[PDB]
Amino acid sequence: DVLSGLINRRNSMARNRVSHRYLSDEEMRVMYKAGLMSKIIRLKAGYALNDTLKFESTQDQEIYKKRLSKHVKNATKFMLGFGRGVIVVFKNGDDLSKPLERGVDPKLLKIRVFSGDIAKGNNPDNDLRSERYYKPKNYTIKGHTIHWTRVVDFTYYMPSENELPDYYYGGMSESELIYEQFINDSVVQRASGSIIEKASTFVYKIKGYKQLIQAKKEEDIIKYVSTCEDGRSIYGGLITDADDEVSTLTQSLTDLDKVDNVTLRRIAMVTGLGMTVLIGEQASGLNASGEKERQGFQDTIENLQSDYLEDPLNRLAEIFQLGFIEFKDRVEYDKKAVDVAKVLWELGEDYGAYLKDKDVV
Amino acid sequence: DVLSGLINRRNSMARNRVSHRYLSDEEMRVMYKAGLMSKIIRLKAGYALNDTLKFESTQDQEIYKKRLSKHVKNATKFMLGFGRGVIVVFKNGDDLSKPLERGVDPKLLKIRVFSGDIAKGNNPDNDLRSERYYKPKNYTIKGHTIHWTRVVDFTYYMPSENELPDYYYGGMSESELIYEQFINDSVVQRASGSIIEKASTFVYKIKGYKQLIQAKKEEDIIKYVSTCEDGRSIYGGLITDADDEVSTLTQSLTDLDKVDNVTLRRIAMVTGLGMTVLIGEQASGLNASGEKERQGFQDTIENLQSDYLEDPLNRLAEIFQLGFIEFKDRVEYDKKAVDVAKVLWELGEDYGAYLKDKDVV
Amino acid sequence: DVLSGLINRRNSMARNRVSHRYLSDEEMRVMYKAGLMSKIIRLKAGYALNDTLKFESTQDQEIYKKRLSKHVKNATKFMLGFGRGVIVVFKNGDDLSKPLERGVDPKLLKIRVFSGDIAKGNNPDNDLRSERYYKPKNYTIKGHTIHWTRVVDFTYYMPSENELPDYYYGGMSESELIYEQFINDSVVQRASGSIIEKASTFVYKIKGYKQLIQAKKEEDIIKYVSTCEDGRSIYGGLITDADDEVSTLTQSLTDLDKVDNVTLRRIAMVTGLGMTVLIGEQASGLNASGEKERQGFQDTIENLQSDYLEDPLNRLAEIFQLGFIEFKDRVEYDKKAVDVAKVLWELGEDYGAYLKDKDVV
């Protein structure tokens, strides 16, 4: 697809090579505040944790729930916001070093949650012995420092190892995924507001106003126009001159909808949320109940649920002696099938063996 | 995507970096009054608290309801309005210090609710001992001061800790989330009203009116035009001159609908309410009953219900000796399934065990 | 279709011959970070591994799942990202040479996962004896080296052997498949954001500004325009001169939607994901549950499942003494048929033989 001219050079192929921005931590902070991604972070985090946690420990049901299931949500928000959510646990005595797990701390401990801004990862062992180049070995949360096994890390989508330090050992803010986007949409929107005030400008092309400004005795003509504009309406006709010329100029974003369309399409892609939510027509098919509507993007959340939330939640599960915690997605839909399972045999009367391996309860 | 020219510099990538406004408290006050967000704050607050509160204490059913469930609503409104809703409780004796919970105050106490305007957060312990950099330790509500454990804080979406003081230790007004928006829409709307009065201006390009103004004996021509305009209609034809020229100029916001569309789309996003409500077609799918219509955005409210309302309500729950309070979302829809549960067994006649673990009552 | 002119030469046939870019490893790294393909890699990898793994070893059910089924996902992501996903296994003692499989390592071993960036393939035996020109015999993961039978390779779509070294013995990043695409879309998008800010430029064609710049005493006219622009609105009419001329120029991407359409169509093709997901209308028919929605592109994933994931997973299956692992795709849909199978015979009462060879459980 390249020959016989200089087409070879000026096409989009060679005219530009690929490169990716590394948005700074301070810029990462700002987008966490900005309204658009604020819902992005809130939506995706909630869609991951809102009553979606399969607990295999019925006894002391969801002691996770009343204590730190709310800490994790702020922390897993800090995942998406900054690429590094952090949960810090330590006993009543502040310690730089590891938690004494010889007798695993029986709820004699406190809980902290930290954004990737103030948190960070420091020390990787370059050898293959204990934890590979990925996992840090000790890093500072503040002026203080916290041991590796002390701390639980909510790490998002990680890049290749050759550049993992540039994200300081963990995750990638959604901003870094859509920094192309949020800037563009903001540009779309800031321009959107200011176009209307300049949508059409009345113009008094007035002969001699060359001179009046030039003689700086232009005070009166401004006054007359100001009085004239103070009343220019459907009801009173202008009075101007043959040599005068009143005209009207319009300027407006001719393709505001197209660009706002393109920018929003991508954000739906990269974030994984539907197009409908960005437009705001949440009523249609993107909802809470998982019958068919949460199914609209549950795959993305499930992709989130089994990639960056399973690692630390399982690690958090063991540190509190809780069981292995997973996710698995009303039942009235299934009940009609349940009766079908019952009516399978009726061997006189015998238990439908398939009743148990469904939503019997 | 960058090479071979100066394209590298002028694109939306590098031509502008990201930054977020910090709207002042006084501006935060004004938007609480403004009509648009007034419904935003009212809608979202009501959608969170209107008969959505699961009470595990059937005995003295909803003593919360008749006493302060209305205080919270004004307070949780103050959450969204200013980023800081406050409930203040103290006994009959005004105290700066903590409430005597040695014997927890048995309803011998008064209730107050405060906006984030007059309220504020003051004193964080920078150490990790008791309450992390987030939670204040003592702050002033007015000229007075109130102890930390005295006061219940309705804190909205919080930013990163590095900048938490700039919001004075808690939450973020929806305005701060949509200050880009409310200004833009107001700009759309203020311009919308004034465009019609100038939608078309009749113009008397009149030869010699150069001179008549210049000789300041222009009184008569204005009088004739005023009499002429006093009757310019379909019924009487103008009389002007060959050298005269009557023309008409139109100016109008060519893309008023597009920009008003873009601005409203985002507000539906960030607030979480549907697009339909902002347009005002509330009849379609955004309603009160949670069968399918409140499901249109119940996820956002549920995201609100389990993020910023659970913390203080649970704290408020214990201070009044009430049980742990949560939320859980008519039954005639479920009843047909209920009968299906009954007809599962009919082992002679035996209780449907699945009857209890549904809406039996 | 060629005669009687010079048409023979200038048509798309001979005017350009075919050639394919070889995007470098560093460019391969960048796209892994970029937002667009970040979802591509995440989506396709998740759609392949999310609860789609048929385990023939019910005993110790899915010991794969809690230990390294998450290692593989990061590794199979590294397949798509770089064309080479790597899983490295070795005992507590670092070894260059082969793992001692005389007694196959009974879970006394560690697990590593590596991107094709830092990993690479080195040594092919050109003879046909053991492993053909495809399979390497020993390659370096870092400064270190790892034996062939030590390491498990997640190799994507491979090119012809004559050029296999140029990809260093394994796979092809999706980037290499859509480098034509990601560059083009990025070009579409970067231009999309910057067009609005220049969608319409107000122009003061002003007589004499020739001279004012030329006399470099042009300070005042800029000041007046700056004050004039500071207020140019619907409400105040411009005042300019007969010799002056105010005009407005619009520039906008006339076919932004068309090109953005074409680019997105191809990415849906090559990646295999639907068009709906790239647009972001994931709610329609591309979902998680495989009833009908995951069927939208499950063939592509199944094509992925039985091409590049079966090889190493089976190799990984044997190295851990796990059984042969495959894939096979709710049941309430099938249950109505199950009852049909039961009601086939009712020979008095006899077992429906077809019950077993379906989803009985």
What DSSP line would sit under B181-226, residue for residue? Answer: HHHHHHHHHHHHHHHHHTSEEEEEEETTHHHHHHTT-THHHHHHHH
Question: Which of these, B265, B24, C113, C15, lies nearest to A307 by C-alpha position?
Answer: C113
Running DSSP on this structure, what letter comes out for residue B323?
Answer: P
Do A200 and B254 make contact, defined as CB atoms within 8 angstroms?
yes
Angle at A167 between CA A265 and CA C86, to 5 degrees: 85
Instruction: Read off the tokens for C163.
Output: 């050029």
Question: Which of these, A172, A155, A9, A150, lies nearest to A93 by C-alpha position?
Answer: A150
Q: Which residues pair with B110 in a beta bridge?
A: B90
Element (H, E) at B18: none
Do A324 and C202 make contact, defined as CB atoms within 8 angstroms?
no
Tokens 């700002």: give the residue. Answer: A30
Q: Cβ–Cβ contacts within 10 Å for residue B80, how many?
A: 29
> Is the Cβ–Cβ distance between A280 and A234 less than 8 Å?
no
> Is the Cβ–Cβ distance between C78 and C114 less than 8 Å?
yes
- Residue C168 and residue A13: Cα distance in Å, rounded? 24
Closest-approach residue (CA) in chain B for A36: B270
Q: Which of residues 203-262 of B touch C (CB under 8 A)?
A: 251, 253
Size of chain A in residues = 361
Whole-angstrom CA distances from B269 to A41, A151, A280, C56, C297 are: 12, 35, 5, 46, 30
Question: Which of these, B272, B81, B265, lies nearest to B185 by C-alpha position?
Answer: B265
- Residue B280 and residue A137: Cα distance in Å, rounded? 55
User: For A196-230, b where at least 16 C-beta lie within 10 A, e where not — what string?
Assistant: bbbbbbbbbbbbbbbebbeeeeeeebeeebeeeee
- Residue A77 and residue A84: Cα distance in Å, rounded? 9
Do A66 and B285 make contact, defined as CB atoms within 8 angstroms?
no
For chain A, which chains pass the contact test of at least 3 CB pairs under 8 Å? B, C
- Residue B281 and residue B268: Cα distance in Å, rounded? 13
User: Angle formed by the axes of helices A35-49 and A298-305, to 10°?
Assistant: 70
- Residue B72 and residue B109: Cα distance in Å, rounded? 16
Point out the residue among B10, B11, B195 whose CB comes nearest to the CB of C234: B195
Helix ranges restricted to H, B34-101: 35-49, 63-67, 69-82
Question: Which of these, C233, A260, C80, C255, lies nearest to B198 by C-alpha position?
Answer: C233
- Residue C309 and residue C286: Cα distance in Å, rounded? 22
- Residue A342 and residue A155: Cα distance in Å, rounded? 46
- Residue A184 and residue A64: Cα distance in Å, rounded? 40
Question: Phi and psi at residue C144, in whole multiples of 5°?
Answer: -75, 180
A-to-C residue pairs, Cβ atoms closer than 8 angstroms: 327
Running DSSP on this structure, what letter comes out for residue B251?
Answer: -
Q: Which residues pair with B353 in a beta bridge?
A: none
> Is the Cβ–Cβ distance between B47 and B39 less than 8 Å?
no
Question: Which of these, B272, B264, B269, lies nearest to B299 by C-alpha position?
Answer: B272
Contacts of B194 in chain C (CB under 8 A): 234-235
Do A287 and B295 make contact, defined as CB atoms within 8 angstroms?
yes
- Residue B275 and residue B285: Cα distance in Å, rounded? 10
Question: Which of these, C63, C75, B345, lies nearest to A158 by C-alpha position?
Answer: C75
Running DSSP on this structure, what letter comes out for residue B167?
Answer: G
- Residue C355 and residue C343: Cα distance in Å, rounded? 11
> Is the Cβ–Cβ distance between B161 and A167 less than 8 Å?
no
Contacts of A147 in chain B (CB under 8 A): none
Element (H, E) at B112: strand B109-114
Q: Cβ–Cβ contacts within 10 Å for residue C11, how many?
A: 12
Contacts of B268 in chain A (CB under 8 A): 279-282
Point out the residue among A273, A341, A347 whose CB comes nearest to the CB of C349: A347
Element (H, E) at A345: none
Closest-approach residue (CA) in chain B for A46: B303
Burial of C323 (0-12, 13-18, 19+ CB in 10 A): middle
Angle at C265 between CA C259 and CA C270, to 5 degrees: 130
Running DSSP on this structure, what letter comes out for residue A284?
Answer: T
Do C234 and B15 make contact, defined as CB atoms within 8 angstroms?
no
Question: Which of these, C281, C274, C326, lies nearest to C43 by C-alpha position?
Answer: C274
- Residue B313 and residue A205: Cα distance in Å, rounded? 66
Strand boundaries in chain A, DSSP class E: 53-55, 84-91, 109-114, 138-139, 146-147, 151-155, 200-206, 238-241, 245-250, 325-327
Question: Which of these, A285, A301, A290, lies nearest to A333 by C-alpha position?
Answer: A290
- Residue B111 and residue B89: Cα distance in Å, rounded? 5
User: Angle formed by the axes of helices C69-82 and C174-197, to 10°?
Assistant: 70
> Is the Cβ–Cβ distance between A178 and A41 less than 8 Å?
no
Q: Is A173 left (phi over 0), alpha (psi -120 to 50) or beta?
A: beta
Determine the distance from the C-alpha atom of residue A124 to the mean position of all C-alpha atoms in its chain, rounded to a whole number.
28
Question: Which of these, A173, A161, A168, lies nearest to A119 by C-alpha position?
Answer: A168
Point out the residue among B204, B250, B299 whose CB comes nearest to the CB of A288: B299
- Residue A230 and residue C108: Cα distance in Å, rounded? 89
Point out the residue among C27, C196, C243 whose CB comes nearest to the CB of A210: C243
The pairs formed by B314-319 with CB atoms below 8 angstroms and a separation of 24 or more are B314/A66, B315/B152, B316/B68, B316/B72, B316/B87, B316/B152, B319/B89, B319/B104, B319/B105, B319/B152
Residues in Cβ contact with A74 at an 8 Å cutoff, skipping those fewer than 6 apart? A113, B158
Instruction: Read off the tokens for A213.
Output: 């400004």
Residues in Cβ contact with A297 at an 8 Å cutoff, skipping those fewer than 6 apart? A47, A272, A273, A274, A286, C282, C283, C287
Q: Mind telling me how many Å the CA of A30 is from chain B's nearest CA?
A: 6
Burial of A73 (0-12, 13-18, 19+ CB in 10 A): buried
Q: Which residues pair with C17 in a beta bridge?
A: A2
> Is the Cβ–Cβ distance between A86 and A114 less than 8 Å?
yes
> Is the Cβ–Cβ distance between C73 and C290 less than 8 Å?
no
- Residue C232 and residue A250: Cα distance in Å, rounded? 12
Question: Which of these, A178, A177, A25, lies nearest to A116 by C-alpha position?
Answer: A25
Q: Mind telling me how many Å the CA of A74 is from chain B's nearest CA?
A: 8
Contacts of A259 in chain C (CB under 8 A): 192-193, 195-196, 253, 256
Q: Which of residues 60-119 of C touch B (CB under 8 A)?
A: none
Whole-angstrom CA distances from C241 to A210, B37, B68, B244, C238 are: 6, 45, 68, 20, 10
Q: Mind telling me how many Å the CA of A288 is from chain B's nearest CA?
A: 5
> Is the Cβ–Cβ distance between B296 and B274 less than 8 Å?
yes
Question: Phi and psi at residue A337, in whole multiples of 5°?
Answer: -65, -35
- Residue A66 and residue B66: Cα distance in Å, rounded? 26
Residues in Cβ contact with C357 at an 8 Å cutoff, skipping those fewer than 6 apart? none
Running DSSP on this structure, what letter comes out for residue B322?
Answer: P
Determine the distance from the C-alpha atom of residue B110 to the mean position of all C-alpha atoms in its chain, rounded to a whole number.
29
Question: Phi and psi at residue A127, in whole multiples of 5°?
Answer: -80, 165
Q: Cβ–Cβ contacts within 10 Å for residue C159, how many?
A: 14
Strands C53-55, B245-250: pairing is: unpaired
> Is the Cβ–Cβ distance between A325 and C66 less than 8 Å?
no
Resolution in A: 3.6
- Residue C230 and residue A343: Cα distance in Å, rounded? 80
- Residue A44 and residue A308: Cα distance in Å, rounded? 13
> Is the Cβ–Cβ distance between B222 and A224 less than 8 Å?
no
- Residue A137 and residue B230: Cα distance in Å, rounded? 87
Q: What is the 3-state secondary structure (H, E, C) of B287-320?
A: CCCCCCCHHHCHHHHHHHHCCCCHHHHHHHHHHC
- Residue A219 and residue A221: Cα distance in Å, rounded? 6
Point out the residue among A208, A270, A341 whose CB comes nearest to the CB of C38: A270
Burial of B102 (0-12, 13-18, 19+ CB in 10 A): exposed
Cα-Cα-Cα-Cα torsion B208, B210, B215, B219, nearest 10 degrees, comes to 70
Size of chain C in residues = 361
Cα-Cα-Cα-Cα torsion A158, A159, A160, A166, nearest 10 degrees, comes to -110
Determine the distance from the C-alpha atom of residue A98 to the mean position of all C-alpha atoms in its chain, rounded to a whole number.
33
Do A268 and C253 make contact, defined as CB atoms within 8 angstroms?
no
Instruction: Read off the tokens for A280.
Output: 């705001």
Burial of B24 (0-12, 13-18, 19+ CB in 10 A): exposed
> Is the Cβ–Cβ distance between C93 and C121 less than 8 Å?
no
Angle at B332 between CA B326 and CA B333, to 5 degrees: 80
Tokens 């005030």: give the residue. Answer: A197
> Is the Cβ–Cβ distance between A173 and C208 less than 8 Å?
no
Tokens 């996820």: give the residue. Answer: B299
- Residue C321 and residue C305: Cα distance in Å, rounded? 21
Running DSSP on this structure, what letter comes out for residue A322?
Answer: P
Running DSSP on this structure, what letter comes out for residue A323?
Answer: P
Instruction: Read off the tokens for B183.
Output: 């200004």
Q: Does A352 reach chain C within 8 Å, measured CB to CB?
A: no
- Residue B106 and residue B299: Cα distance in Å, rounded? 36
> Is the Cβ–Cβ distance between B169 and B134 less than 8 Å?
yes
What type of residue is A358?
K
Question: Which of these, A247, A126, A259, lies nearest to A181 by C-alpha position?
Answer: A259
Of chain C, the end-to-end C-alpha distance in Å amounts to 63
Tokens 């070795």: give the residue. Answer: C90
What type of residue is B320?
F
- Residue B229 and residue C243: Cα distance in Å, rounded? 31
Running DSSP on this structure, what letter comes out for residue A295?
Answer: G
Determine the distance from the C-alpha atom of residue B79 to the mean position of all C-alpha atoms in its chain, rounded to a whole number.
10
Residues in Cβ contact with C63 at an 8 Å cutoff, skipping those fewer than 6 apart? C320, C322
Determine the distance from the C-alpha atom of residue C147 to the mean position of all C-alpha atoms in its chain, rounded to a whole number.
29
Size of chain B in residues = 361
Q: What is the 3-state secondary structure (H, E, C) of chain C?
A: CCCCCCHHHHCCCCCCECCCCCCCHHHHHHHHHCHHHHHHHHHHHHHHHCCCEEECCCCCCCHHHHHCHHHHHHHHHHHHHHCEEEEEEEECCCCCCCCCCCCCCCCCEEEEEECCCCCCCCCECCCCCCCCCCCECEECCCCCCEECCCEEEEECCCCCHHHHHHHCCCCCCHHHHHHHHHHHHHHHHHHHHHHHHCCEEEEEECCCHHHHHHCCCCHHHHHHHHHHHCCCCCCCCEEEECCCEEEEEECCCCCHHHHHHHHHHHHHHHHCCCHHHHHCCCCCCCCCCCCCCHHHCHHHHHHHHCCCCHHHHHHHHHHCCCCCEEECCCHHHHHHHHHHHHCCCCCCCCCCHHHCCCCCC
For chain B, which chains pass the contact test of at least 3 CB pairs under 8 Å? A, C
